[PDB]
Design a protein around this ligand. Structure first.
Ligand SMILES: [Mn+2]
Ligand SMILES: [Mn+2]
Lengths: 206, 205
């Protein structure tokens, strides 16, 4: 149906393509149940409301004005859209020169960045997301948020444009890693698409 | 070590005893990793604070005076201690006469209560718990809380003494049910120990 406000973008890889880090059954459920549900519920939640014709970024920027259903499902849809795009089965991607320079000046190295994101992910009590954002000053920052909240929401303490997000809801890792979220976080770097993160960085700075 | 402030109560059944609703792997991890972690981190978080020799209920009742680590781990420890106690492998328990009468007068029937708890559990976005509590009015109430918060915590709006809690963190159900939290909630009734719920009701009154 071309007239629904929001649609899930198909994955640019197979469900089993990320098996170095994420099991195929999790990819399938995470995409076809969890994310699909957020998108469907988003469309329902904004229908007949002032949010109905707003872009996802604009919904999020005013999310405190809308229902919890809008907030939770707008977050969910946005976060997952971004998540799938920053994963890849193509090994050895790396940050663009511009991004790498910013990473090194801000964190020291790519390993130091990964350590900071891993720590943020591990410290998120309950469900949530770890983020690398470009803040409103153009500077990189690592944050985490609860549930499906994200750095574009007016509610959020550390605001910025996300360029990388890692889902630390238990559904994202429990089938393969159970309670070992840290092992999930260590391993997911194997499938991060730094080309997409770098594109998001370039667009954020504009 | 007998001197630790909080200990996990041994499980009163085997890890595979609840397979009518909860897989053995989940029980083992849930108990020996998630709950054990809360208990250990609680003991650490209270060390050298005014909470150090307080009862768990008294920590919860004043929880906002303490760190977030105390809140999260006191809630974690409390909630799981209660949770294990209200599960059983023995089919066919039922509320006491007193609890059954109260349930019927307040919700209509046991089925109506289960429906209300199932709905509360399903509606809890993210991690958390569904509860049946006794409010200070003696009245039964169904609520939910986020994360490891619970109805004994000082800041909680819907306060009361929990007599039944059902964990809806994904770790409680993902290995067996994956996204199907509603199926977990429907099925868990088969292992609820209404004799313990009823003993908790008696104590709460
Ligand atoms: Mn997710
Ligand atoms: Mn739990």
């Amino acid at each position: 149906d071309p007239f629904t406000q929001f649609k899930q973008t198909p994955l640019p890889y197979a469900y089993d393509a990320l098996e170095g880090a994420i099991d195929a059954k999790t990819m399938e459920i995470h995409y076809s149940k969890h994310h699909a549900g957020y998108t469907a519920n988003l469309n329902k939640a904004i229908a007949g409301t002032p949010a109905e014709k707003e872009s996802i970024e604009n919904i999020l920027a005013k999310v405190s004005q809308y229902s919890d259903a809008v907030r939770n499902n707008a977050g969910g849809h946005y976060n997952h859209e971004l998540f799938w795009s920053i994963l890849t089965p193509n090994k050895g991607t790396k940050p663009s020169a511009a991004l790498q320079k910013a990473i090194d000046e801000t964190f020291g190295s790519l390993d130091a960045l990964k350590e900071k994101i891993n720590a943020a992910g591990a410290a998120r009590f309950g469900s949530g997301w770890a983020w690398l954002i470009v803040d409103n000053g153009g500077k990189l920052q690592v944050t985490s948020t609860p549930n499906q909240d994200n750095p574009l929401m007016d509610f959020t303490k550390e605001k910025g444009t996300p360029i990388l997000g890692i889902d630390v809801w238990e559904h994202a890792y429990y089938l393969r890693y159970q309670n070992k979220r840290a092992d999930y976080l260590t391993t997911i770097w194997d499938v991060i698409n730094w080309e997409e993160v770098s594109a998001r960085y370039e667009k954020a700075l504009k």
